[PDB]
Design a protein around this ligand. Sequence first.
Ligand SMILES: *[C@@H]1O[C@H](CO)[C@@H](O)[C@H](O)[C@H]1NC(C)=O
Lengths: 387, 480, 49
Amino acid sequence: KIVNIGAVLSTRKHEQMFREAVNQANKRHGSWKIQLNATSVTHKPNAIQMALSVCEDLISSQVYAILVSHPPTPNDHFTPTPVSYTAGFYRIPVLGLTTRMSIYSDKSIHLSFLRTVPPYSHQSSVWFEMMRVYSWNHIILLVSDDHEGRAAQKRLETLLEERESKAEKVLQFDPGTKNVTALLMEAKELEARVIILSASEDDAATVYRAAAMLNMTGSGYVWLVGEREISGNALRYAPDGILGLQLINGKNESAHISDAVGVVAQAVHELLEKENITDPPRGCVGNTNIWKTGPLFKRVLMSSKYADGVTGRVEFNEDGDRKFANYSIMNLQNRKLVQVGIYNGTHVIPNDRKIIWPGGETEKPRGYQMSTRLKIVTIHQEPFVYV
Amino acid sequence: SIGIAVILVGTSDEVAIKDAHEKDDFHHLSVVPRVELVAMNETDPKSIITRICDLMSDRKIQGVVFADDTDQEAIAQILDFISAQTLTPILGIHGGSSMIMADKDESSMFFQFGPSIEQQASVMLNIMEEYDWYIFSIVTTYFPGYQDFVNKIRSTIENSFVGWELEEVLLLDMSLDDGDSKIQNQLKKLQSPIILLYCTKEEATYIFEVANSVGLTGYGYTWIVPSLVAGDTDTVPAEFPTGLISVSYDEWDYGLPARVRDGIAIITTAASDMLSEHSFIPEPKSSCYNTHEKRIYQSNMLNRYLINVTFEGRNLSFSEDGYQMHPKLVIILLNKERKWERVGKWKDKSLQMKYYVWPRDDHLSIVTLEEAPFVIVESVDPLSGTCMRNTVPCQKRIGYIKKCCKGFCIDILKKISKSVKFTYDLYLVTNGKHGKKINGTWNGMIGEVVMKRAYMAVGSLTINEERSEVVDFSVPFIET
Amino acid sequence: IDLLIKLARTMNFTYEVHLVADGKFGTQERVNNSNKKEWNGMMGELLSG
Ligand SMILES: *[C@@H]1O[C@H](CO)[C@@H](O)[C@H](O)[C@H]1NC(C)=O
């Protein structure tokens, strides 16, 4: 049967050839009662008509899975909430493609939403072993006061506890503050020689700005940043020798549907063997009650792990997020980008190209230092310590 | 001006709310409330946005009181989107907009009347401190947000003067496939007489299917669950074992006309003080269309001005998470059949419990009298409520007083209590001391046992023929 | 103090001596809320950095 399933995708040309991506999935599937069709609508990069441009054509089309796209503006996170809220009540699943924040990962809200790309907070997991292989016992952590930043500091501190590490010292940064050099210099008193950062585009530039006059770029320092700090409005004052991470093929939305349509199309194959297989009521006005089969549809989703497509080996489960993600280790040199490693999902695979650090030192400084000046404490006692 | 358009979905009497609408005696300040009485079946999201689209665009309407009689938890999530896009505060009193919610955007001035999970954790730790059930187990199921309440448990215990006997924490999975049989396997490793359970109302029957399978729920165990599991007193899953006790959100003394009067008064007077000092009324774009162009009329400063709320002798301050932090909590217990009755009251962090000790094989009444070397009584410690460790509780008649008994003779009773299992509630003698026979009647501790009120008496009793005829003394353990 | 000078010249110290602020050795207890169990005196000072 003609099932109108699509999404509110930007980049009209991207959804143009997606109209034939289902045709590729149309041949692969052997199901007979269902003939899924694509009825997409243009994106609305504004909040004016989202009062009337979410379900007015999707739920009335009896959708089952909804993808998502990204607006041309890079600083945007309002795109996937209006679609998720309508699907949250009706319990009908939706699929996140360009979704990148950690807001749509806690599952406390948006009970029905699947992600094809790990959120930015997940980079902390691979970061855990990143310095462990190169010793570097002591680290200094400083994040912007953001929910994604809150998630990253929460997960890492619940990840390094297995190493019996106390994370040395933790600093908090509030977005929207510029004169923060007083906060920054307090870290200089620490013996740790590892600097990490996970902030926004506006925060990355000013943090790097404060790293110039205080000679953080000098030798004896190592810096690790997320993919959100290598790219964008942060290379104007980017310190040299940054070992920042990089996402691979995550921006190829043309290839996004290749793995997106495969899981959903074959998911119904296992579903067409049970009862209560009934479409949700038509329209968005005449249906005020949710059909009984709600989250049961999802129960067949994470059970599907198909290693096919442009990327392949997709194993969405647990938190509705991709497992065994792929990131490329990146090193910035003299305002040039050169790959120096790759993380296949389990272990670290470096590259033959020489890895550089700020100041030109080929040797890797130890992520620790020693202080020869100590402060002792004593109490007035008669036979031991006269006063 | 300012309009308060109410919405009532379900079966309710909105006629009297019109009188409640014309009852805002706040002429002291320029409230100018244009209260509207709107009530229609508009559960679908398309109806909600379209109905408010013509509503909030009428004339500068900046207030909505939400009243509902349906338990659809998904309505509140939709409500946040409208508040996030617009800048009109919205409050709910009942129905699908009264349950908890993790967090929202900074541009959502939505608050409700109901405590969250972390508020529940403190509530039942306090009442159980009265009964001194120091040993207890914590059991919870997987849930979207099942971490906050259990996190508050560890915060309180560590910085506690009185020791806490934590009988571990169980994190079994209920929604996991092929895990239903595993519930019974994890249910055979509990020994604490008190167990705290968190589940969902729909899965409460599913969870209790295995909970009743092991059957450690007849008389000697007590179950604690949040108010969300019960939902309502009338609506009962019917599989709950007799004796279940839980906290609840007050609804019997908080009626719909009563709970709607509080919300309407606060909203109008919340911004009244704004005009008193800054001499400006916050009136953003009251237009349904072009919501993006309304981003220049920021009202976050006005949002921070709603913290101070006082009316009818009670403060109703709200936090960033959308909490009330002033809940009227009523505890409910399960009767012989499916029924929930009020157990206690809450009034400014004060808990009053109707009974004195938990009622009712293994429990045996005991009668004891103070005597210098063996049993010595003293008043309870006011610093920590209880007396002290190693000091057994001791009720005294008259009313009653939380007295405390200690000494050497009572130490023997503890040793044999573990030898042969039995519970007790020690209480002192009322008429006479050590028992005398007057007019063929016995008083004292020997008078309680003969009249079938004690079943056991301990202390400093001397064996002789007259007393040995009525009761059966055990083997002596002290020369006299 | 004579002991400290011996340790100083055998593993390259550089010290500075300052007595405790109050006088008490150290004990864990709660203050002002019965729910702030924490150290005090010299023992509290060492854990405060
Ligand atoms: C202390 O340091 C000095 C120079 O910094 C040098 O004599 C040696 O490294 C140390 N002295 C010892 C170990 O006696």
